Symmetry: D2
């Protein structure tokens, strides 16, 4: 029933981090990309939430993924430099945990995302849209619960149970009221 | 604010005046998107004929909508489809005993409004909420939606008030829908 | 250098026919389909050429192929019925040899077509067009010499050497002057 | 009736007034479609810089055209590309020493006219006349032509009269073009 069964390797490499190390925390999980249309908006909002609400129990987790218009083509070792010097650029550094690149859809999906997709089969704000241009669906198999683009969001309660999914178009910062409800 | 299937109409395969589904009030409807050269063409057409024959007198109406969006398995023209069924597959003189409509799309911006409606009303098959397509190259319509019909011969069961009741996947046999139909006829 | 190295099984099944059995004949080879936009035009013209020029040394050979808009979905055992009763319909029967369904492009291509494509890398009448809708290119790998659609044509001389390739838009019957030159 | 490359112009990466290639008469041109996050980005950019540095004084001009049609390997905006090269890949402070133009398409109906021309003039790479794409899902432009650029970093060598002389595939190293360039410079 919970995300605590799963682990992932930090972007820099090294030992996997178990999500069970985050028991009691509210988690905001996003699949991320460095050259997407919402890279700047979502990374800056993720930083803002982590800074403001981290001390109260929020942990933001980002999972780089190259399945959506190949908008994460850089290697693991290149991503922080892209964020700092290209987009957002201007010295930007994430203040939350990034993991190694993975897949979120198809047979190669990281098990955490297979789990999240099945637990919350469609975004709360957009139950219907999957992809406008079918040429951009290039993973296999394709499922009705698949992540549609960069920066979908999954909100997980302090018991590790996925609570709500938000689409590519639902701004990260607009999840704050739902996070604050869980914190208090 | 919720429509029923009776809002919609479709042209018979032979052409001519649209038939409004509103004329079918009181009937239980089994609606399928069909194809003439699909892996389940024989099984579903034979089973649809069986249900129509046996349960028609008690209020079942089976409605088939040819569609070429799934492996291009309905490439024949409207005027060719009955010949394909009769002489090719199933062949052997086979004739549908239920209503077929003109070829249409079920997915994407060009979808017939009846299917856009059914998909929204029943957003995933009751028996398989997750599978959409194994080979992504076979998803060729636009836009793509989570509620899209996945292959030839999905099934929609509609009550005698026009309300969609249940959706069944491409793998769920037509004949296995009989108990759900019987419950509505009763 | 010649097509005589290759064999194919007749549509009805049974022992392969070696193309070496056709030494001395002019060959017109087409990839065919039963539900294509030029099915009627090309099948009727193929019959006409076989009837008129067969006695003088022409052999027409058709290779059903489902790689182009899946326009050959019928099984081998179904194709003649489709031609007779659906399209062209009206009792139509090919008067030339049809073979079992095969692929002409990609790693699974019948070796005859791999050979023909390499020998004559682009149609004589259209060196450039391959596909308008890229979603219809679904074989692998993709090569510059690939057959573009149903009913490309390959004209082979009486020595078995491929002489000329013709595109999907070059009518079968318009190959007659080139055939007649080789016959005489 | 045959054009030369001098018929065409392109806007510098930084923007502003189109540069006509006609201003380059007398120069040997090496034209490449480029990308910042490709498997040969480091190799080709480093080798292009080397050729430009060594053979520039003798008449070589290297011209790079960013293009996002191949695995979306040029997703960065025009205003981001130099930063990606400097700080990401190759990184380490790398700066091109040759002219880059604004992002464009090389294949399909939207292709920059220079590439539509080059493709027709030299319809297949001299070293690989046959390969176009291994994974068909990566062919996403329209229409598709037999002469299409197959991946990032194809190369076109143009003589000092503007006539395209030779095309080289995505796999043929930039530095391995040097002998052909030297022959034209001589």
């Amino acid at each position: 029933q919970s995300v605590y069964a799963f682990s992932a390797r930090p972007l820099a490499g090294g030992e996997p981090v178990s999500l069970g190390s985050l028991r009691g925390k509210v988690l905001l999980i996003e699949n991320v990309a460095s050259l997407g249309g919402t890279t700047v908006r979502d990374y800056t909002q993720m930083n803002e939430l982590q800074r403001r609400l981290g001390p109260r129990g929020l942990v933001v987790l980002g999972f780089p993924c190259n399945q959506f218009g190949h908008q994460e083509n850089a290697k693991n070792e290149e991503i922080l430099n892209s964020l700092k010097y290209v987009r957002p650029g201007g010295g930007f550094e994430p203040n939350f945990m990034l993991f190694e690149k993975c897949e979120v859809n198809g047979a190669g999906a990281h098990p955490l995302f297979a789990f999240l997709r099945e637990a919350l089969p469609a975004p709360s704000d957009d139950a219907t849209a999957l992809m406008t241009d079918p040429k951009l669906i290039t993973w296999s198999p394709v499922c009705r619960n698949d992540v549609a683009w960069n920066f979908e969001k999954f909100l997980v309660g302090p018991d590790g149970v996925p609570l709500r999914r938000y689409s590519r178009r639902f701004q990260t910062i607009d999840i704050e009221p739902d996070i604050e409800a869980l914190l208090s």
